Design a protein around this nucleic acid. Structure first.
Length: 206
RNA sequence: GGUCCGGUAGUUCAGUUGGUUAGAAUGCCUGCCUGUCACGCAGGAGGUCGCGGGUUCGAGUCCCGUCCGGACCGCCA
RNA sequence: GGUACCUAACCAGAAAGCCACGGCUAACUACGUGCCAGCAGCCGCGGUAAUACGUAGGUGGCAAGCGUUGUCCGGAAUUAUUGGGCGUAAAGGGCUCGCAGGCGGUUUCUUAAGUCUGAUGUGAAAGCCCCCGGCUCAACCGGGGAGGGUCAUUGGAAACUGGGGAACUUGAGUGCAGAAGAGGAGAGUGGAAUUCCACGUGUAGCGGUGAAAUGCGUAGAGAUGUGGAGGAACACCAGUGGCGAAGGCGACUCUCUGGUCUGUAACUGACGCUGAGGAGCGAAAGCGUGGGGAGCGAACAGGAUUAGAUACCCUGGUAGUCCACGCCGUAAACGAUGAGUGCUAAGUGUUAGGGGGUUUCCGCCCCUUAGUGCUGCAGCUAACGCAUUAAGCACUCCGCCUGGGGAGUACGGUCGCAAGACUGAAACUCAAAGGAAUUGACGGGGGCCCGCACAAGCGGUGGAGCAUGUGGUUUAAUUCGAAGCAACGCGAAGAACCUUACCAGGUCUUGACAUCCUCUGACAAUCCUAGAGAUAGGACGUCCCCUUCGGGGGCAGAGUGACAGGUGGUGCAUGGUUGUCGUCAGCUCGUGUCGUGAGAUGUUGGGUUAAGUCCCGCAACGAGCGCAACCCUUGAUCUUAGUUGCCAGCAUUCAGUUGGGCACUCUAAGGUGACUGCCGGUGACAAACCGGAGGAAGGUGGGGAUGACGUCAAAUCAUCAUGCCCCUUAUGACCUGGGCUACACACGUGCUACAAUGGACAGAACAAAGGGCAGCGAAACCGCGAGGUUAAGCCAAUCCCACAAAUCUGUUCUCAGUUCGGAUCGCAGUCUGCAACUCGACUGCGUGAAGCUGGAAUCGCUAGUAAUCGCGGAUCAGCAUGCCGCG
């Protein structure tokens, strides 16, 4: 018996859906193509890294906003590449699309980016101890109020798995006023499967 | 070899006398109880009477023989 | 022996292996192996991811050697003099008296046995050690030294241990004056009881246990008043009091008798301590002889309890328990601590004294010995703890111990009449056995507190029928998963086909599905016989965008090898999810302290609440996750908004629809709101608790959401992926049919009843929250019905689903297996779907079953709850007694 997802609980009261469009009688296919474009862009931008992408609807014209500073580097050199990929989104959606790039300053306190960092450090053969203990203090001095991070799977001791987590700070999950951002990521290793769960207390909301 | 006993539920004993009814524990089965088992609590089936023959309206239970065992006797030179 | 050696010439050519690689201990990776094969000195390894098994590469150690075996010494402070211990780990003899033996107060002369030190004589050679010399270092071989006696003669010294002589008094005794005592042995004496007996009175039970029963009583019990008879122990005094060496010793008196302490200083002057063997005592049981026998009471009987009860319990009761004399010689004979001596902080009781200061009054205090307790320094201790009554600091003497079992057994002896006691092996076997403390768990342990946990109530479950799930059986298959709470109307929010995996049959192979390679260029669909896939072929019958035209882009088709497929296994390889204890109140860390260490503190103690909630102390001070709140929703109201709602006043109507208006409800946004806020009391004033008032709501108002660290190798390989295998002419795929619905039985969860607080018929009502565009579907007509016809409005506060039932009123029925119950049946239909036999639902007939309140047992429920009554909704063509939600 495990905990409820914190952002899962906080959606709609202190968090927006990250899909801000109304539909009716088109809800199913709008939703489906939303998942399709999410999957496509996440797959093909994983190397550049991106946390969260919102979708917006107007006159049957989809429009997007995409996060993280690295797609900032995709603006300049990939400015041709931005048009090249959004051509694919046009082809998929049928009707043409608009996009926007928003830069997440201070990436050390984005849950998904942190999770992807941990996943990469794990998959290129670095020890969970070094990776996790370094990342927690990185985020803390980046200026979070509290962090708890956790990894699970066959943690080196391949013959049996276990769980482990570090944390330092204040992190209330039961309070429905905090801004506990949450993410999780999956890391595939030779000796099994590794999963990551990281969340950070940014601050309350008023 | 003779005389006397008996032979019944799967096991042990009543009934076997009352010619006109087949019973009591144990066992076994189902359920409950217990985390499970064992106790324990509810319920339930069974033999149709060693074997064969005969009397009788009716034989388990009366009279015969056959098998089975058990008790007693088998002595005098 | 042409040997050693020297002189030349030829050649990297003839000449490296052994063991280990998890830790001890220096060296690691790949494959096979899968409690097998095997490894080993110990720990131990190996049950498909082995640095520990066998191989391979490399590394590591050593080298003409390297490993194993066997023997001895070290490590072993593990037989300890150097160099150990005996309170609880092994170990103080049960206690005492004492021969031999081991030890010996102070001073003073003397003797030199011990003692210390010279001289001499030897302690062979060769060895080890030192210094040199030589074999081309040395291995070795020499030369010179040194060491090597608990050694013989002799000399020197006298502090100490011995010997002798003379002192001395503190140690040890004697005498003198007191004091105390369950100290011992013998004789006698006395009081209350228990029992028995006789006697008076005396009716109906007495006795006994958790209930009971055996027993005793009308032959007169028990009870109660007398008088006897006896045998055992000595109530309060009585006190961690006293005595004794120990066992042990309590009524009184007497006879005999042991030891101790106090004060002395009159005496002897070291006469002392310890003590193997030896001797004597030595509780209770036990034995022998002779008495005695009240009560108690092994054995034994009877009655209970129990499945059994050879016991625990009850009623009896033999031996013993007692006395005299002998014997045994054991006890947890314990302070689990041998005896003696001296020294080392205190405080505090208490027993027997002595001295002194105020009195030679009492009783006030100060010293002082000897006991006998309790706290507590240093010190010791592994911890407990001991601590002038050492388990501290030291010296003598004795006894005892050296891993656990085997076993205090075996054998042989010495005792004993006997039971048995003392002495006391071994083989074999194990790597632990143990002491104290630490943290959890648990107890038929204690102290608190909580919860529909139990009580106190309601209605249920199993008894019947049926719906559904599960076990078993059954098949060709009855697809798999789930298995106490926490699986079993569960994955399944829907099985005629489809789903669907499974079974039978028929079929395919780069394969429906995905990317790559070459072509054909844009490729398909309709209809025909066999037909189920699919195939034979057909009738138009393979028909785009850009291209300086080369060719590209996408679209399909063909061939093509890489590949795709795994609802195939492994939840004990995992991720990611979920249940459970549990919405229980706990769970932790930072720093600091205490301990030596496991560890503790905070986190305990007072109350407090629901709470680790708060306050108050506290070697703790803080923090974090939990609790609370922040969130949703229902409860009172203010502002804004009045259409598709609402109609207060008006005209109108059957259509409060219209006209008009947001009055009212209602709708949905923003605030108000309840916050212990206020008053009294309780409580320290604190925290809080009780009672009031205001208040729509008073003490987290109600409900929901929220589920800490973690346990259950809890569930899921059916979303996901190393791992192996299945192959791609099969576990991968397409189609037809069957199944998951079977049915001799068992269980779980539910619906319907078993009737008159009812059935049937008629009338009258009141009303949520949701859904509705391959949708909702009005009205009217048709059918007595399930429904059909033609269809208005509604993308919905407008239209529809949609006439909520229970209920109230009235008529009949008159207690029955009934007008209850409606099961199961044959007939005839409706709907959907290509399709209703396996295998739908609904309806009209006919039928009408069991059942008349359900054993033993067992469940939910603290007021809008349970109990009933309906109404929607996900699943979706049809399929709801299930589930979710609403009133």
């Amino acid at each position: 018996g495990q905990k409820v997802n914190p952002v899962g609980l906080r959606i709609g009261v202190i968090r927006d859906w990250e899909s801000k469009w109304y539909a009716g009688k088109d809800y199913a296919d709008f939703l489906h193509e939303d998942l399709k474009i999410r999957e496509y862009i996440s797959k093909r931008l994983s190397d550049a890294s991106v946390s969260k992408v919102e979708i917006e609807r107007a006159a049957n014209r989809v429009n997007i906003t995409i996060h993280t500073a690295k797609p900032g580097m995709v603006i300049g050199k990939g400015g041709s590449e931005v048009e090249a990929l959004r051509k694919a989104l046009n082809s998929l959606t049928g009707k043409r699309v608009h996009i926007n790039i928003l830069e997440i300053k201070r990436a050390d306190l984005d849950a998904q980016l942190v999770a992807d960092n941990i996943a990469r450090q794990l998959e290129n053969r670095v020890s969970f101890r070094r990776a996790q203990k370094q990342q927690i203090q990185r985020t803390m001095r980046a200026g979070a109020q509290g962090v708890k991070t956790m990894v699970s799977g066959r943690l080196g001791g391949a013959d049996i798995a276990r769980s482990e987590y570090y944390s330092e700070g204040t992190v209330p999950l039961h309070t429905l006023r905090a801004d506990i951002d949450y993410a999780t990521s999956e890391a595939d290793t030779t000796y099994g499967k590794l999963g990551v769960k990281v969340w950070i207390y940014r601050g309350e909301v008023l």
